[PDB]
Design a protein around this ligand. Sequence first.
Ligand code: CLA
Ligand SMILES: CCC1=C(C)/C(=C/C2=NC(=C\c3[nH]c(/C=C4\NC(=O)[C@H](C)[C@H]4CC)c(C)c3CCC(=O)O)/C(CCC(=O)O)=C2C)NC1=O
Ligand SMILES: CCC1=C(C)/C(=C/C2=NC(=C\c3[nH]c(/C=C4\NC(=O)[C@H](C)[C@H]4CC)c(C)c3CCC(=O)O)/C(CCC(=O)O)=C2C)NC1=O
Ligand SMILES: CCC1=C(C)/C(=C/C2=NC(=C\c3[nH]c(/C=C4\NC(=O)[C@H](C)[C@H]4CC)c(C)c3CCC(=O)O)/C(CCC(=O)O)=C2C)NC1=O
Ligand SMILES: CCC1=C(C)/C(=C/C2=NC(=C\c3[nH]c(/C=C4\NC(=O)[C@H](C)[C@H]4CC)c(C)c3CCC(=O)O)/C(CCC(=O)O)=C2C)NC1=O
Ligand SMILES: CCC1=C(C)/C(=C/C2=NC(=C\c3[nH]c(/C=C4\NC(=O)[C@H](C)[C@H]4CC)c(C)c3CCC(=O)O)/C(CCC(=O)O)=C2C)NC1=O
Ligand SMILES: CCC1=C(C)/C(=C/C2=NC(=C\c3[nH]c(/C=C4\NC(=O)[C@H](C)[C@H]4CC)c(C)c3CCC(=O)O)/C(CCC(=O)O)=C2C)NC1=O
Ligand SMILES: CCC1=C(C)/C(=C/C2=NC(=C\c3[nH]c(/C=C4\NC(=O)[C@H](C)[C@H]4CC)c(C)c3CCC(=O)O)/C(CCC(=O)O)=C2C)NC1=O
Ligand SMILES: CCC1=C(C)/C(=C/C2=NC(=C\c3[nH]c(/C=C4\NC(=O)[C@H](C)[C@H]4CC)c(C)c3CCC(=O)O)/C(CCC(=O)O)=C2C)NC1=O
Lengths: 92, 54, 161, 161, 160, 32, 160, 160, 280, 173
Amino acid sequence: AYDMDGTGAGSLEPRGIKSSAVEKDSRCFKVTFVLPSQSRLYTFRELQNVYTTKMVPFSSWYAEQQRIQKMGGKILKVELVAGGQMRSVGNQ
Amino acid sequence: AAVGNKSNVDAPSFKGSNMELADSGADYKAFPKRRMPGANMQGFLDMAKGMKPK
Amino acid sequence: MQDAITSVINAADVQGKYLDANSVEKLRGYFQTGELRVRAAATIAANAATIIKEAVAKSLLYSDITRPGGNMYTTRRYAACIRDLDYYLRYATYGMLAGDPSILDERVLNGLKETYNSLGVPIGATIQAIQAMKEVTGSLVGSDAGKEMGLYFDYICSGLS
Amino acid sequence: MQDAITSVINAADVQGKYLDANSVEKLRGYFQTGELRVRAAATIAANAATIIKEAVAKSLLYSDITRPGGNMYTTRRYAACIRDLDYYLRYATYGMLAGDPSILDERVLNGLKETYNSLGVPIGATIQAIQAMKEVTGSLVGSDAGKEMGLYFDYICSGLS
Amino acid sequence: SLVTQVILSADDELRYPTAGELETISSYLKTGEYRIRLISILQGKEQEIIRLASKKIFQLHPEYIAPGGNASGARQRALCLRDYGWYLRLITYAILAGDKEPLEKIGIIGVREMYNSLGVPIIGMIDAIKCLKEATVEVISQEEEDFVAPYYDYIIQGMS
Amino acid sequence: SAAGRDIESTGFAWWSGNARLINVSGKLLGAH
Amino acid sequence: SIVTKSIVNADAEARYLSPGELDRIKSFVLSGQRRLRIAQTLTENRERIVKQGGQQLFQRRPDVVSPGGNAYGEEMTATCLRDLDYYLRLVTYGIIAGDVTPIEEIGLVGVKEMYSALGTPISGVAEGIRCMKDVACSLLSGEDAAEVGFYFDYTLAAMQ
Amino acid sequence: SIVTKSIVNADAEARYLSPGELDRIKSFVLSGQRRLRIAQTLTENRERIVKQGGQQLFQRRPDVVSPGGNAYGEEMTATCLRDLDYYLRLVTYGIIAGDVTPIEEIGLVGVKEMYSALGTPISGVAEGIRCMKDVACSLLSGEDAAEVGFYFDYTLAAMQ
Amino acid sequence: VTKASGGSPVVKPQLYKTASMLTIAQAEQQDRFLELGELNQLVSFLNTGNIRLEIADLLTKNANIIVARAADRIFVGGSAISYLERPQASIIEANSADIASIRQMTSVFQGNNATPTGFKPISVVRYGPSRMKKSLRDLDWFLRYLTYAIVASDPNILFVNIRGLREIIENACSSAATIVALKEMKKTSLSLFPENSIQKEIIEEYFNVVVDEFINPALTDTIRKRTSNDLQGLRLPQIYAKAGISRQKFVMKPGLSTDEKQSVISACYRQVFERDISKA
Amino acid sequence: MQDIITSVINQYDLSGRYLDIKGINQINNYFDTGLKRLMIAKLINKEATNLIKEASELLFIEQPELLRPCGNAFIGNAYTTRRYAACIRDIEYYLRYSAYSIIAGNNSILDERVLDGLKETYNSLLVPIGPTIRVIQLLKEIIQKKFSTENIENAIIAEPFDYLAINLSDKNL
Ligand code: CLA
Ligand SMILES: CCC1=C(C)/C(=C/C2=NC(=C\c3[nH]c(/C=C4\NC(=O)[C@H](C)[C@H]4CC)c(C)c3CCC(=O)O)/C(CCC(=O)O)=C2C)NC1=O
Ligand SMILES: CCC1=C(C)/C(=C/C2=NC(=C\c3[nH]c(/C=C4\NC(=O)[C@H](C)[C@H]4CC)c(C)c3CCC(=O)O)/C(CCC(=O)O)=C2C)NC1=O
Ligand SMILES: CCC1=C(C)/C(=C/C2=NC(=C\c3[nH]c(/C=C4\NC(=O)[C@H](C)[C@H]4CC)c(C)c3CCC(=O)O)/C(CCC(=O)O)=C2C)NC1=O
Ligand SMILES: CCC1=C(C)/C(=C/C2=NC(=C\c3[nH]c(/C=C4\NC(=O)[C@H](C)[C@H]4CC)c(C)c3CCC(=O)O)/C(CCC(=O)O)=C2C)NC1=O
Ligand SMILES: CCC1=C(C)/C(=C/C2=NC(=C\c3[nH]c(/C=C4\NC(=O)[C@H](C)[C@H]4CC)c(C)c3CCC(=O)O)/C(CCC(=O)O)=C2C)NC1=O
Ligand SMILES: CCC1=C(C)/C(=C/C2=NC(=C\c3[nH]c(/C=C4\NC(=O)[C@H](C)[C@H]4CC)c(C)c3CCC(=O)O)/C(CCC(=O)O)=C2C)NC1=O
Ligand SMILES: CCC1=C(C)/C(=C/C2=NC(=C\c3[nH]c(/C=C4\NC(=O)[C@H](C)[C@H]4CC)c(C)c3CCC(=O)O)/C(CCC(=O)O)=C2C)NC1=O
Ligand SMILES: CCC1=C(C)/C(=C/C2=NC(=C\c3[nH]c(/C=C4\NC(=O)[C@H](C)[C@H]4CC)c(C)c3CCC(=O)O)/C(CCC(=O)O)=C2C)NC1=O
């Protein structure tokens, strides 16, 4: 279901990205960032634009924001376009 | 021309040689008919000349 | 995935020899039919939906595979057929241009009869659909071009059998 | 992504009218230069590595962007340049064939100057590299063909500025 | 450096450094000054060594020095010693931060396409570094040159 | 391939720049 | 056109254009003189190609014009011929572009959604284009009728 | 070898190895010094043992090399001696293994199917191995010639 | 010993492209019949056809003359062309082309300039036979894939086998003793055709693709570094991936034409669902 | 993978017992030769690009067929330079994973990362298994040329290369 079942350290599925997203979450951000690949010079793949602006969901913004810095990216701006704040029920 | 003239006996076919022209050699199989002596094998060919004449 | 030129170059290369008179003799034979194959592949591209509509209505339209219980009953299952028959008429067009059926078994034939047995698709009705589809394809492209396009249909039917 | 024929058809279509004498008048002008553009794109494909090697050695090879601290110091950063200059010489070749610079801003110009500012890439040295690359390209393809290929280089330099 | 590899390598698993990794930081920091003492030995012999590198890279490869080769001319040979100076400077970085990243984030990653766009034969540069390692053995005793030996041949492995 | 037509390709300067033909036997034959 | 999608094909593949792609851009531009003559024939024959186009369309599909048909009355019949003037125009674009790319993104992409949402029988408009094809190919020689008819039947295929 | 089939014998019988089996593994390994000397003699005498082996083979069987024979010409005669180099090699394996188990599953099992399927007279290749045997036993003393010849005649027996 | 097995399906690795070939594959990968542009693609290279083929036989017939005239230039020591060995596979035959070199038992000069400056030509007696057993074999092969590139569509088969080639043989070969030999074949092969006719420009353009790219630095090895522990890093020569049809990608730059934005989206359907269900 | 140590500890865990002295004697034999296992590894990094080059010429000098046309058997030997480029690449791997496996003192890294599917992969491409194994031991003799005056480094160097040889064989006996 959601990503906070009871998993933490020392648990059977591997220790990973745990987001505070509810059941079928409907909140999503509008993020903007550059993310240079830092791996094209030994792979020699084709090049793709690294400056992107896209709507990521609340269910997986934290994983994406945690990963964009993994590969040296810089986050220029993020906002919560869709969803409420301090909302107990209704994020579903 | 057939030249079927007469006295077509059967026994005693003899010897000699002629090697008549091929045909149909105008077809097209993609593989050869295979033959030997690659490299890993130049040693023994040069070396079967030795006994070739015996 | 080899055409007639790729297959000729491979056999001439696999013996390490140049393109002798016999290798170029077949290549000249392929270039002579190069004009016929494009016009054959031209009209087949135009009448792709019409050919498949003619084959299914002529072979397996009203048989009891079409009725309930038959192998083609539900609309998802019927729609999979004309999707499925489109590949046979399409890949056969590729073999007709390349002049070599290597693309068929590379991308169609392998794991095909083993897949229809899994789904339970009737191989008997499948080949007759392709045979009927081969019959209408000889209508459009003519006789000799139909002989060329027809030469790869039964190649599918043979291996799919 | 429109060529000269696509742009002519679009403007003639966007008013809902047929291809009158003025629309075909430009199309005939494009077909006249069709022979020049292919030979221009022919030699540029051959001397792609030689042109980029000539531009960097003539514009920014020994400047202090090349030395430590400069924007091009490390081997990853140097290797990104000739990778980066390859697109400018390549996409400019596409604009020279299509006869319309729509492909450049569609696939090169948009988010480009906004990207170099993020990385901190010097736009000043970049344009002079493309200007020097434009200078050697006029050497190969000739004068008028260089005028054509050169017409899309400064289009990149203008928008990248 | 080495601590950076442990912080990074422990960070993609979302965990603190384990028992073995904290050894790898602790043992690295206890051998600290000996890298510091060693790099000052090499910095005082950079004019020592690159003069000896130009000995054998060119007697081995007179193709490059001759008229027509890339290194023909004064100013081409002038930077020629500069590339030795940057490489030797990079190795002092690698000898200090006890790993290969300063030899890899600089110098190694994409070096072939740099030289290939320059005309320098990439095989010749491999012998240049091999020449440079051959030159460092003379001005260095047996104790500490096998400490610096594995940092050289990584560059040769990186360039192939 | 080609060799020895400079100061720091052989060691000899230009006033000695007739003695870059000692280990170069082909140019020396055309010199004689 | 053939020029723009032979580019975007080789664009996606990270490569330049092969001889197979550049000997056809070459072969297409030398074909350009003959294409403008063919499109010039259909350009000022739209009065007959459309009006005789709707001629056979109503004789073959009297339902669409009969009371209850979608094109019933003085009003809809005028728009009934308006669409044929559209599709006859797009065929002139496809002949000059050497491809149905102009016809693709105009009048073909999502055409079934429009005509289904207008209440028009999409099979009926397909019958209209076929009637225009016999009038168009009757205006040209055999070498041309294999082209002008060739673009109509593609429109027939995508319109059902 | 004697070690592996003395095991698989006692393996099948659900038992360990008797003194009759373990006093011969013992007796074989003390024999191992003398076996390597014997195989060492045949190892670098293959030039004479094979070439003189095919010497007597053609003098005794001129049919196989005459025109029409299987080993006719420069080509087949080279392969004609190649097989003798094979079988001379397997005898060196049997001497070191102390058994024809290496010769059994290599060059003996199903050998008649190969040579019958190659058109080669299997009796002719048997004559070749006998000619090699007289050359081999002429290179060793009487105590050794009772072994090196001993493995050839087993190959002669299975090859007919 | 390995205690399991995934099986080995028959796989034919890519070798080269041809003009008859890749355009059949491009529309193949997009799941469509080729269109009239690409049908116009497949036709007039077939319409090249016999022109490509006759270039082979005229080039193939005097193959020894093409190879021998290079031998006179850069090989001291008499003829030194005995080490040729045309059948390179040791087969009896199936059929053979005709070459028929020297008949009775460098003739006229009048323009013959091979070495640009003081280049040392290889000797032969000092160069030794075993190394000599390749140099005529490779002067052979440069005649070969050219006469496979003419008969095929493109020069791509030359590009794959000549990119890193000069580096690999750079230690047992003076490289400039190849560029002289490769520019002797075009000078010899241009003796055959009336120049400023169509065939003269065809084969000339294929010679300078192999000789100018011969003097060109080899591609760098591509590396596949893995992300986590249990994987293993690999390494492939960049030669290896540029042989064959070379499968395409699709990108969604907003602002494309809505077809190429439609061909990319439907390309996304086939990837994730394995069959374009919107078409199906 | 598993080194000599972890392989030893799993040996005692399966039985669920602590490490006795026979277990520790196996670990001590690694710790003694562990310092000797490194300059074997350090020599390989210094001799890596060379040792592949001597292996190739020593291979093709005995297998000239590998540099020739394949015959109609579409077989992958070093025919073309595309074939030759990738074929030298395999000698990279056999020297590499046999270099780690010298340091681990155990062939656990070998079979799971080299042997598993090796006959699978070569049977697909029709690659020579015979010459492929012979080049593996041309490297072994070439590496043992350096450490030859004594003979306790020799058994260390032989263990990885000998393991690939016995395992890539279709078993004749
Ligand atoms: C067959 C005779 C012969 C030969 C082959 C050589 C060969 C050589 N000598 Mg040597 N030498 C010779 C005789 C010879 N020498 C004699 C007779 C003397 C005594 C004077 C010397 C003294 C000598 C010295 C001191 C040196 C050499 C050097 C050299 C080397 C380079 C030469 C050079 O660059 O000069 C280039 C030429 C000049 C710079 C021009 C000099 C012009 C002189 C000063 C004027 C000549 C006057 C003449 C009689 C009339 C001229 C008419 C006038 C109107 C112009 C070369 C191997 C050098 C060396 O060791 O290299 C390894 C060196 O340093 N030589
Ligand atoms: C590694 C650097 C880094 C940080 C720090 C980070 C923070 C971060 N904090 C979040 C939420 C949150 N953070 C808090 C925290 C707090 N509430 C309080 O009253 C306190 C003041 C505070 C605890 C100290 C809460 C309650 C949420 C949930 C908000 C919601 O459901 O709307 C979220 C939204 C997604 C998710 O949690 O799955 C992110 C991405 N991400 C990063 O990559
Ligand atoms: C390109 C080579 C190639 C082929 C040919 C191919 C066939 C293929 N046919 C399928 C199904 C099917 N195929 C049929 C076909 C038929 N029913 C009949 O009665 C007729 C005899 C026949 C039409 C001629 C049907 C009904 C299904 C659906 C089966 C089901 O839902 O269980 C499926 C299952 C998945 C899907 O359709 O999405 C595959 C993968 N895949 C390939 O990659
Ligand atoms: C097809 C249109 C297009 C372009 C042009 C493009 C550019 C682009 N240039 C980049 C970097 C770069 N570009 C340069 C370029 C230069 N340094 C200089 O001094 C010069 C002025 C200049 C060479 C002319 C350098 C050094 C980097 C690396 C920056 C870094 O590592 O921080 C990057 C970061 C990622 C990467 O290279 O893998 C992108 C995405 N992307 C595109 O899609
Ligand atoms: C920190 C890592 C690093 C390196 C190594 C580097 C190298 C580098 N070498 C260059 C040129 C050059 N390099 C050489 C080099 C040589 N000739 C020989 O015979 C030798 C074997 C070799 C020197 C030891 C030559 C001849 C040129 C000039 C080529 C030309 O412009 O014609 C250039 C062009 C500008 C310049 O000289 O500064 C760069 C950037 N940049 C870097 O950031
Ligand atoms: C360039 C591609 C293109 C097409 C094809 C197109 C069609 C189109 N057809 C329309 C109406 C119409 N179209 C018809 C057509 C027909 N009635 C029949 O019986 C026949 C079967 C058929 C014609 C042969 C009728 C009757 C209407 C009016 C429907 C109404 O008033 O409700 C309308 C709404 C009115 C208008 O704006 O014209 C559009 C937009 N637009 C385009 O951009
Ligand atoms: C290790 C056990 C072993 C043996 C013995 C063996 C034999 C063997 N003998 C062969 C051929 C041959 N063998 C002969 C042999 C002979 N001609 C004569 O006249 C003589 C009687 C006789 C030799 C003394 C000839 C002529 C051929 C070539 C036949 C042909 O080309 O059709 C071939 C096919 C070519 C090849 O791959 O070498 C095999 C495999 N393989 C094995 O693994
Ligand atoms: C069809 C395109 C094509 C070519 C040409 C090719 C060449 C090729 N030449 C090779 C070697 C060689 N090639 C040559 C010689 C020469 N080579 C020349 O192009 C010159 C004419 C001559 C020097 C003047 C020599 C001497 C060797 C042996 C080098 C060595 O021992 O490593 C090798 C390594 C295997 C071998 O020993 O033959 C290849 C794969 N491969 C290809 O796919
Ligand atoms: C880590 C362990 C490991 C190995 C060894 C390995 C091998 C491997 N060898 C390959 C090909 C190949 N390997 C060779 C090798 C040879 N040809 C000969 O004639 C010689 C016997 C031999 C050189 C010794 C050739 C020619 C190919 C290409 C086959 C072809 O495309 O024709 C390929 C397919 C290309 C690719 O790498 O993607 C793989 C995966 N992969 C692994 O993960």
